[PDB]
């Protein structure tokens, strides 16, 4: 019985685990580490003032209720258990219609380490919008932003930080970029605070 051990370890891990409560509800705040890997900077459309992007969005937060002791020390879990534990919500402030792909199964991998550190990546195709200034047409240069923040959580409860050095977080593939008119130049990151 190779699976009878792991099934016990993975049922005891979910026993008494309430997915409605984020880790440390009265204790110290949680800290979600984020990263992005652009697969292909989609076709910018001049008419609609929108642009498409295809990212491998990633998240990594420290949850203490999930730690354990076992032989593997890394669990490569299926795509089903990702909905039974807590997962932070993250919408795009300027997304007209985003879609998450489920090609043959939902494209979400969950890696629960032995310490309690998670990794929860997705795959997204985002039709974000950006305002354009065409006063310098055709010789203009745009800056189309992408602003992803938390939702339902104030600053005192969930705080985002880039996973690696901020200059190297937003990585872009070499051949993935495709554009007819424009030509990608560089990436720039910046964290702020917005009140609503």
């Amino acid at each position, epitope marked *: 019985d190779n699976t009878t051990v792991f099934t016990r370890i993975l049922d005891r891990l979910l026993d008494g685990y309430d997915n409605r409560l984020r880790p440390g509800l009265g204790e110290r705040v949680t800290e979600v580490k984020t990263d992005i890997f652009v697969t292909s900077f989609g076709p910018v459309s001049d008419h609609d003032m929108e642009y498409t992007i295809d990212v491998f969005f990633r998240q990594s937060w420290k949850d203490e209720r999930l730690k354990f002791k076992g032989p593997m020390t890394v669990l490569r879990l299926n795509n089903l258990m990702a909905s039974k534990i807590w997962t932070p919500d993250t919408f795009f402030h300027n997304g007209k219609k985003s879609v998450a792909h489920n090609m043959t199964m939902p494209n979400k991998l969950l890696r629960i380490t032995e310490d309690g550190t998670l990794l929860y990546t997705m795959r997204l195709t985002v039709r974000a919008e950006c305002p354009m200034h065409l006063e310098d047409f055709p010789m203009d240069a745009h800056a189309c932003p992408l602003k992803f923040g938390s939702y339902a959580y104030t600053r005192a409860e969930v705080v985002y930080e880039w996973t690696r*050095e901020p200059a190297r977080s937003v990585v872009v593939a070499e051949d993935g970029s495709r554009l007819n008119q424009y030509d990608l130049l560089g990436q720039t990151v910046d964290s702020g605070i917005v009140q609503s």
Partner: antibody, heavy 116, light 106 residues
Framework: VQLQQSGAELVKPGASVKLSCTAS????????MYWVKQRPEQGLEWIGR????????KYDPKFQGKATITTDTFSNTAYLQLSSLTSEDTAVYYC???????????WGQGTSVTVS | NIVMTQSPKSMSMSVGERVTLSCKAS??????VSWYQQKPEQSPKLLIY???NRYTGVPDRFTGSGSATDFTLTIGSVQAEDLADYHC????????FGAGTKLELK
């Protein structure tokens, strides 16, 4: 919280010395560890960075190959090894942690190394 | 590599007067610039992280404000024990530090 380092080190040129800062009050596998050296009355300077979980280490190109940073996760300690010491290498060495927007919130006591 | 320029190099002010410091950054660093306070023969502490944010346990007389390249640390009612060295440091990329400003009373 509190960061403890080793005592003073006095060593002649052509010998390797090993400096260590021992963390306490927090698990090291959460945040990175930095190393800043300060000569007498000059601006702070960056040596290298270590990540205890993965193991990746990046160094300042002017110091690359001269100093190697290794960590012992089980003992919760970060080690700094110096090699090819020269007379002008005399300076104070600091251990640092990352936290709250990459700002080095906690700093060690500071170890004094004199090469002569 | 990113280089930080700091001015003035060294200035002295009286007790209870407004004081302005500046740290110029050649490349782009968007609101990831921290300010450290090193007293003589001690360990440098933290005052400002990000920009216009005060680390805990810090008096309110310290205020910051920054942009893509310009940055400014403005002390309020300078007390007696506010004589030390202030270092502007950025962490947008591999972290570097400024030359450092030395503050003496008069």
């Amino acid at each position: 919280v509190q960061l403890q380092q080793s005592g003073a080190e006095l060593v002649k040129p052509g010998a390797s010395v090993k400096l260590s800062c021992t963390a306490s009050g927090f698990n090291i596998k959460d945040t990175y560890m930095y190393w800043v050296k300060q000569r007498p009355e000059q601006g702070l300077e960056w040596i290298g960075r270590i990540d205890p979980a993965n193991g990746d280490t990046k160094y300042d190109p002017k110091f690359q190959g001269k100093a190697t940073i290794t960590t012992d996760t089980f003992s919760n300690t970060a080690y700094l090894q110096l090699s090819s010491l020269t007379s002008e290498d005399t300076a104070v060495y600091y251990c640092a942690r990352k936290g709250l927007r990459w700002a080095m919130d906690y700093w060690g006591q500071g170890t004094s190394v004199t090469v002569s | 590599n990113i280089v930080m320029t700091q001015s003035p190099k060294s200035m002295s002010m009286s007790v209870g007067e407004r004081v302005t410091l500046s740290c110029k950054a050649s490349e782009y660093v968007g609101t990831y610039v921290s300010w450290y306070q090193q007293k003589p023969e001690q360990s440098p502490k933290l005052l400002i992280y990000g920009a216009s944010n005060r680390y805990t346990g810090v008096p309110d007389r310290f205020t910051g404000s920054g942009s893509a390249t310009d940055f400014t640390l403005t002390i309020g009612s300078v007390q007696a024990e506010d004589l030390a060295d202030y270092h502007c440091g950025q962490s947008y990329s591999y972290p570097t530090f400024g030359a450092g400003t030395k503050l003496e009373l008069k």
